[PDB]
């Protein structure tokens, strides 16, 4: 059913693709900085697009867009959205994308907890775990 951040990555494209007024907001905030290679390649194409002074519609985008991106870019332009992204919607999506490298992180110390646990260093792994609970609260 797909993890949150991915859906936000997805939907965000679905919006900027349709509205190039949104894409301009996404650009200063997310690089990307997008987390999935496909989404990164598409965002590079989207951003460009309008910088070609270019009006705005997917009929144009999906026609751009190497061809290996098309099967995906096509099925994003059909997704399902209200046209209009709520003020907070955007901050909620961008927050997910932006603070995804931070979750991909704590699984680095996750492997350190378990490696400490294996050498019977129980109080060290505990600390690591207490550390994670902190990053996790963010």
């Amino acid at each position: 059913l797909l993890p949150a951040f991915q859906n936000a990555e997805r939907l965000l494209l679905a919006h900027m693709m349709r509205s190039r007024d949104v894409a301009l907001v996404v650009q200063e905030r997310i690089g990307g900085r997008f987390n999935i290679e496909e989404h990164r390649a598409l965002a590079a194409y989207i951003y460009a697009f309008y910088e070609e002074g270019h009006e705005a519609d997917p009929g144009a985008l999906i026609s751009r867009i190497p061809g290996e991106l098309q099967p995906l870019a096509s099925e994003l332009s059909l997704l399902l959205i209200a046209d209009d992204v709520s003020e907070q919607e955007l901050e909620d999506y961008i927050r997910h994308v932006l603070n995804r490298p931070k979750w991909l992180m704590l699984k680095v110390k996750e492997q350190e907890k378990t490696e400490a646990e294996r050498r019977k260093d129980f109080l060290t792994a505990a600390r690591i775990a207490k550390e994670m609970i902190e990053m996790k609260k963010m």
């Binding site: 059913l1 993890p3 949150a4 939907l11 907070q88 919607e89 909620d92």
Partner: protein, 358 residues
């Protein structure tokens, strides 16, 4: 998909549940699974306690549909999938819409299917087919100081005139209908469920040419009576009165007949003779209000019961549908939304059967 969004967003906010629940009931959801969840979601909210993954999974388990949905896996799937809870409401509207569409289809398909199995009814079929599918200003009264408190009778209001038997409620509504017909230029529609259409006519013929002790009923007249009916007949001969004494009719037929008359000739007043006698009454009250609204015309519904509000109220709503409630006792306008509430006093002749000014 939008279904999964609402459910999801609840696991997220979960103040999300509030707008979701203002717009959905469990039944709006297409999948039973979600129905179950959304119900449990609410059933936990009715404490409580609050609503979150473990607390729902626990209500679902309790009433034992946990594994009858997904597992906790599908609950988590929903929880982890959703990226924001600033939509929900939504989403909600989407699910609510697609719900309405299923009901539309169902009640419409139930009509076709029902078309062959009755046959038999046509009239019950055509009525429970609307029923199923549904789920001074002014106009002067004739009477100087009734006009003032009300300024009409205006268009889209339902006026209910109540009075105990034989106080004069018919004779009152008839004079209103008469004045409006003879003095303005505005068609009036009368439904006289009780009395015949021709025993109604002399009751407004008497009301005019100031005729009758002599009497129309008891055969012969004097030269003064004859020379009188002739103008009374004459004057009322050009008025815009339409009568329908059809024994006792259902609402949809008042509504259908009044509708056809509006496009072909005009229409200004619908004066229904007594409500309690049309063919629960709260469901009729409702329909009369809508009738008035649709035709931009004041509907005068006479009613049967001192007096005051709770005399009629105890027998079928009315109170909150009628925007002006008159009582014959004294004419007591006990409720009106135009403005004032008080007692207007009218004289009553008898011999001529007139209500008159003062």
């Amino acid at each position: 998909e939008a279904e999964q969004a609402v459910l999801g967003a609840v696991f997220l906010d979960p103040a999300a549940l509030v707008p979701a629940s203002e717009i959905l009931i469990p039944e709006d959801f297409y999948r039973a699974a979600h129905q179950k969840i959304f119900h449990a979601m609410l059933r936990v909210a009715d404490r409580g306690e609050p609503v979150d993954l473990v607390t729902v999974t626990a209500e679902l388990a309790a009433s034992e549909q946990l594994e009858e949905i997904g597992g906790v896996s599908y609950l988590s799937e929903l929880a982890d999938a959703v990226p924001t809870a600033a939509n929900v409401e939504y989403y909600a509207r989407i699910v609510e819409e697609k719900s309405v569409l299923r009901r539309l289809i169902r009640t419409a398909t139930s009509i076709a299917q029902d078309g062959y199995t009755r046959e038999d009814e046509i009239d019950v079929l055509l009525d429970e087919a609307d029923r199923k599918i549904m789920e001074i200003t002014g106009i002067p009264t004739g009477f100087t100081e009734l006009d003032r408190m009300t300024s009409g009778f205006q268009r889209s209001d339902l006026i209910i005139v109540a009075a105990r038997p034989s106080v004069g409620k018919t004779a009152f509504a008839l004079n209103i209908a008469q004045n409006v017909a003879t003095k303005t230029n505005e068609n009036v529609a009368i439904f006289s469920l009780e009395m015949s259409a021709q025993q109604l006519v002399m009751r407004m013929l008497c009301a005019e040419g100031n005729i009758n002790a002599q009497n129309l009923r008891t055969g012969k007249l004097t030269p003064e009576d004859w020379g009188k009916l002739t103008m009374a007949m004459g004057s009322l001969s050009n008025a815009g009165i339409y009568i329908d004494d059809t024994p006792s009719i259902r609402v949809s037929d008042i509504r259908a007949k009044c509708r056809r008359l509006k496009q072909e000739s005009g229409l200004g007043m619908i004066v229904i003779d007594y409500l309690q006698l049309i063919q629960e009454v709260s469901e009729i009250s409702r329909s009369l209000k809508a009738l008035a609204r649709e035709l931009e015309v004041p509907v005068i519904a006479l009613s049967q019961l001192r007096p005051m509000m709770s005399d009629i109220r105890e027998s079928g709503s009315i109170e909150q549908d009628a925007d002006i409630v008159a009582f014959l006792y004294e004419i007591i306008i006990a409720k009106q939304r135009n403005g004032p509430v008080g007692t207007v006093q009218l004289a009553f002749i008898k011999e001529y059967n007139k209500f008159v000014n003062l």
